[PDB]
Swiss-Prot record, chain B:
Composition bias, Basic residues: 1-12
Description of how the protein assembles with itself and partners: Part of the 30S ribosomal subunit.
Function according to Swiss-Prot or TrEMBL: Binds at the top of the head of the 30S subunit. It stabilizes a number of different RNA elements and thus is important for subunit structure.
Gene Ontology cellular component annotations, sorted alphabetically: ribonucleoprotein complex; ribosome
NCBIfam families membership: PRK14753.1, ribo_THX
Designated name of the protein: Small ribosomal subunit protein bTHX
Gene that this sequence comes from: rpsU
Organism: Thermus thermophilus (strain ATCC 27634 / DSM 579 / HB8)
UniProt KW keywords: Ribonucleoprotein, Ribosomal protein, RNA-binding, rRNA-binding
From Swiss-Prot, chain C:
Keyword field: Metal-binding, Ribonucleoprotein, Ribosomal protein, RNA-binding, rRNA-binding, Zinc
Cofactor, free-text remark: Binds 1 zinc ion per subunit.
Gene Ontology terms: biological process: translation
Pfam family, one: Ribosomal_L31
Matches recorded under InterPro entries: Ribosomal_bL28/bL31-like_sf, Ribosomal_bL31, Ribosomal_bL31_A, Ribosomal_bL31_sf
Protein name per UniProt: Large ribosomal subunit protein bL31
Record-stated family: Belongs to the bacterial ribosomal protein bL31 family. Type A subfamily.
A molecular-function term among this protein's GO annotations: structural constituent of ribosome
Subunit structure: Part of the 50S ribosomal subunit.
Positions bound to Zn(2+): C16, C18, C36, C39
Gene3D superfamilies: Ribosomal protein L31
Required co-factors: Zn(2+)
Curated annotation (Swiss-Prot), chain D:
PANTHER family the record matches: 30S RIBOSOMAL PROTEIN S13/40S RIBOSOMAL PROTEIN S18, SMALL RIBOSOMAL SUBUNIT PROTEIN US13M
Location of the region described as Disordered in the Swiss-Prot/TrEMBL record: 94-116
Gene3D superfamilies, alphabetized: 1.10.8.50, 30s ribosomal protein s13, domain 2
A biological process term (GO) from this entry: translation
Organism: Thermus thermophilus (strain ATCC 27634 / DSM 579 / HB8)
GO molecular function: rRNA binding; structural constituent of ribosome; tRNA binding
Biological role: Located at the top of the head of the 30S subunit, it contacts several helices of the 16S rRNA. In the 70S ribosome structure it contacts the 23S rRNA (bridge B1a) and protein L5 of the 50S subunit (bridge B1b), connecting the top of the two subunits; these bridges are in contact with the A site and P site tRNAs respectively and are implicated in movement during ribosome translocation. Separately contacts the tRNAs in the A and P sites.
UniProt similarity note: Belongs to the universal ribosomal protein uS13 family.
InterPro entries the record matches: Rbsml_uS13_C, Ribosomal_uS13, Ribosomal_uS13-like_H2TH, Ribosomal_uS13_bac-type, Ribosomal_uS13_CS
NCBIfam families: uS13_bact
Stretches assigned to coiled coil: none
Protein name (Swiss-Prot/TrEMBL): Small ribosomal subunit protein uS13
From Swiss-Prot, chain E:
Entry protein name: Small ribosomal subunit protein uS19
Protein family per UniProt: Belongs to the universal ribosomal protein uS19 family.
GO MF term set: rRNA binding; structural constituent of ribosome
A cellular-component GO term for this protein: cytoplasm
Record organism: Thermus thermophilus (strain ATCC 27634 / DSM 579 / HB8)
Gene name tied to this protein: rpsS
Amino acid sequence: PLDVALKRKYYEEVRPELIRRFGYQNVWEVPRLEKVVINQGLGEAKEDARILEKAAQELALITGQKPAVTRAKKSISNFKLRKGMPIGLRVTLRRDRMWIFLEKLLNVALPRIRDFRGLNPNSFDGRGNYNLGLREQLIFPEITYDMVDALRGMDIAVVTTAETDEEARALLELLGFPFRK
Amino acid sequence: GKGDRRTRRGKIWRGTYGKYRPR
Amino acid sequence: MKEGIHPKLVPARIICGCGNVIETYSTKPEIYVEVCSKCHPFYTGQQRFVDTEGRVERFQRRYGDSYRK
Amino acid sequence: ARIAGVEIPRNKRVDVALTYIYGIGKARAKEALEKTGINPATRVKDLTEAEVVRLREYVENTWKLEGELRAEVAANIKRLMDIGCYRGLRHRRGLPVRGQRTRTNARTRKGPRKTV
Amino acid sequence: PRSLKKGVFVDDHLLEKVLELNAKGEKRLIKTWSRRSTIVPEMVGHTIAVYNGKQHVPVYITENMVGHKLGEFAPTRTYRGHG
RNA sequence: CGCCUCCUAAAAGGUAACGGAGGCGCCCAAAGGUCCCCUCAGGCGGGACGGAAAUCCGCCGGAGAGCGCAAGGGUAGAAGG
RNA sequence: GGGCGACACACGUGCUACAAUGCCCACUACAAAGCGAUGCCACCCGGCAACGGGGAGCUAAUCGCAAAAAGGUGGGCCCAGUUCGGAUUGGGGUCUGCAACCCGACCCCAUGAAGCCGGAAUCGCUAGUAAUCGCGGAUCAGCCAUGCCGCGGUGAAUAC
RNA sequence: GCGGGGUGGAGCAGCCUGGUAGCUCGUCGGGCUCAUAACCCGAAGGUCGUCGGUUCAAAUCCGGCCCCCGCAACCA
Ligand SMILES: [Mg+2]
Ligand SMILES: [Mg+2]
Ligand SMILES: [Mg+2]
Ligand SMILES: [Mg+2]
Ligand SMILES: [Mg+2]
Ligand SMILES: [Mg+2]
Ligand SMILES: [Mg+2]
Ligand SMILES: [Mg+2]
Ligand SMILES: [Mg+2]
Ligand SMILES: [Mg+2]
Ligand SMILES: [Mg+2]
Ligand SMILES: [Mg+2]
Ligand SMILES: [Mg+2]
Ligand SMILES: [Mg+2]
Ligand SMILES: [Mg+2]
Ligand SMILES: [Mg+2]
Ligand SMILES: [Mg+2]
Ligand SMILES: [Mg+2]
Ligand SMILES: [Mg+2]
Ligand SMILES: [Mg+2]
Ligand SMILES: [Mg+2]
Ligand SMILES: [Mg+2]
Ligand SMILES: [Mg+2]
Ligand SMILES: [Mg+2]
Ligand SMILES: [Mg+2]
Ligand SMILES: [Mg+2]
Ligand SMILES: [Mg+2]
Ligand SMILES: [Mg+2]
Ligand SMILES: [Mg+2]
Ligand SMILES: [Mg+2]
Ligand SMILES: [Mg+2]
Ligand SMILES: [Mg+2]
Ligand SMILES: [Mg+2]
Ligand SMILES: [Mg+2]
Ligand SMILES: [Mg+2]
Ligand SMILES: [Mg+2]
Ligand SMILES: [Mg+2]
Ligand SMILES: [Mg+2]
Ligand SMILES: [Mg+2]
Ligand SMILES: [Mg+2]
Ligand SMILES: [Mg+2]
Ligand SMILES: [Mg+2]
Ligand SMILES: [Mg+2]
Ligand SMILES: [Mg+2]
Ligand SMILES: [Mg+2]
Ligand SMILES: [Mg+2]
Ligand SMILES: [Mg+2]
Ligand SMILES: [Mg+2]
Ligand SMILES: [Zn+2]
């Protein structure tokens, strides 16, 4: 399988330093990444122009993986929502494609972000997972100003094998996540 | 323009000078 | 993976404006960025860009000590 | 976005485009194009990726712009409002600040007329 | 503003009261008619009663509010709105 | 005024009153046959626009969800998707 | 010392505009009436600039205010809420004055709002007029003058 | 006891057929007038009597209570 920088860096620098700080007695005890799930709760495409192949074409370029649909679980009056209506996209990244995405995310995306002052320290699950939001998909390198019709950001969920926020915090900072406080 | 101080026509209006109307 | 629904991954060349080049994989073989991890203000320690201000106000006026005592 | 954090209008002369940035006016435009030796007349679409990064690097490094500019000015009023200055109460009651009559006009600070 | 080449204005008589108290250690009350004055670094922590035309308004000065005039802290008008 | 559900009904079945409460006079070409796979409501925590509530991640949750429509019975070891 | 400068609102008189018969920069023309000895201040220098330090002339057809401006030549903008428009505010300075918080003008950096030609209604002007352009004076330390009293430049349409 | 009804300030629509509150007058701000009326131009205000339920959503469909109009209350 693929040799990439972050995947390599995890085993080489992140792994040992982690075993240092928390002193695990088993290799599998030490924090790992399981999956990063990307989401676009969209729903602007509820009725209107429920043609969002433009964003599925977007997310497919960002992650090299075809997103799946999300549809309404229940109908909602105030939101103008028929049950089963197509209102969002979700792609689940594991293994190599997970690293490659995070790799470009940490090295490129967060920098290009408007007035970036560091990731939110407090967006930590409690069970050692992490979630963050994006206002724009232009934040990535593979999406030029030209090929976009409208601003559409996303939800980003990263799951760890950790049990506490503290091991999770360390695993992620050691990988290269920039926290403000 | 005549209300816009940062122009030639503008400072003639006020009857003052500066970088945007030199003497 | 399924075939015919997936954009294809290839070795990629992300270039920054500091002249950082990043070795990775992508759907596009060559990309240029405006900024990166290697040069960003918040990123590089605490390179406080245009303002190492310390305010400066408000004790800072000090013009001067010439009022009398 | 190109410079700085915003993507200045391509198809305009490089000097005008720059003013489409919060924090850079006509003066600061010719001023950035002096200290970089870039032709004030050329269309933005016709910058070298070299000319780009040079023009880029000066502007971003000399002046506070877009986000942080707004941020300080914000904090500047924030404090003025919070010390209880006269200029503070005027911001906190939303009225004008610079010795204008309020009995008429004053609309730009006040907003559309709340008739009675 | 007050022309930078000249001075930073404080009414002579009030400056002295601050400085007298500085020696002794501050602070009593300071009934004043000195709106034309500048708040000045020696004044921090004192409690000054400024005349707004009507009352003597108690203003605790801080390290943040220095370069201003005194009267900016004694409002001349009472306004609660209309209707 | 016919039909269905519950109670009255006295632990088989049945049981009256101008006793107490509600529903039906339809519907579905899939909401049917079968093979294969899947598990809910809700609570806490986390997440751009995003709200009490859209979609996303985690942990707890035997059924309090769902089963077109009244009610009862049944039911996730499916009759639910 | 404060108020006459307030501000949920309504009206009168105005200023500047919404732009290409226009906006902007450079160079370049042609007025008049006035005004001026702790007054106007040529010119030189420091300053992006307001201004500041020098310093000559003039009781003024002599010297100064002084450039008139629309205009002319050239160049840029290219129909866009814009190189239109310049309100609102942030930051920094000059000056007058004992003193510019309430509550002055001006200069500079940044901010760049409303406004795409105006509902019912309604005003002025018959020719060197209307429209448009600049200049001065009184009051006056400075100035909230876009007001007022004058002065010239360009210069119509129409009255059956 | 049977049928109908409650919606800006007044008086009526919309309810049957669930998603969208309308008409005349009146009120308020402007205009014409010396002034008022009329007339002309703009503009506010009903969360639909309540509490409950059905629904994805109720002025609208279903129940409760409240108040109003009409009719009935006969052989005795
Ligand atoms: Mg946390
Ligand atoms: Mg991008
Ligand atoms: Mg975990
Ligand atoms: Mg302009
Ligand atoms: Mg004009
Ligand atoms: Mg700008
Ligand atoms: Mg005022
Ligand atoms: Mg029958
Ligand atoms: Mg029985
Ligand atoms: Mg029984
Ligand atoms: Mg029985
Ligand atoms: Mg039997
Ligand atoms: Mg089927
Ligand atoms: Mg079935
Ligand atoms: Mg089937
Ligand atoms: Mg749940
Ligand atoms: Mg939640
Ligand atoms: Mg939110
Ligand atoms: Mg939510
Ligand atoms: Mg059930
Ligand atoms: Mg008066
Ligand atoms: Mg008006
Ligand atoms: Mg006026
Ligand atoms: Mg007017
Ligand atoms: Mg605009
Ligand atoms: Mg003042
Ligand atoms: Mg402009
Ligand atoms: Mg507009
Ligand atoms: Mg236009
Ligand atoms: Mg016009
Ligand atoms: Mg007109
Ligand atoms: Mg008419
Ligand atoms: Mg006549
Ligand atoms: Mg005079
Ligand atoms: Mg004067
Ligand atoms: Mg004023
Ligand atoms: Mg004048
Ligand atoms: Mg009514
Ligand atoms: Mg009907
Ligand atoms: Mg209907
Ligand atoms: Mg009226
Ligand atoms: Mg009338
Ligand atoms: Mg429901
Ligand atoms: Mg409704
Ligand atoms: Mg209801
Ligand atoms: Mg309801
Ligand atoms: Mg009812
Ligand atoms: Mg009767
Ligand atoms: Zn870089």
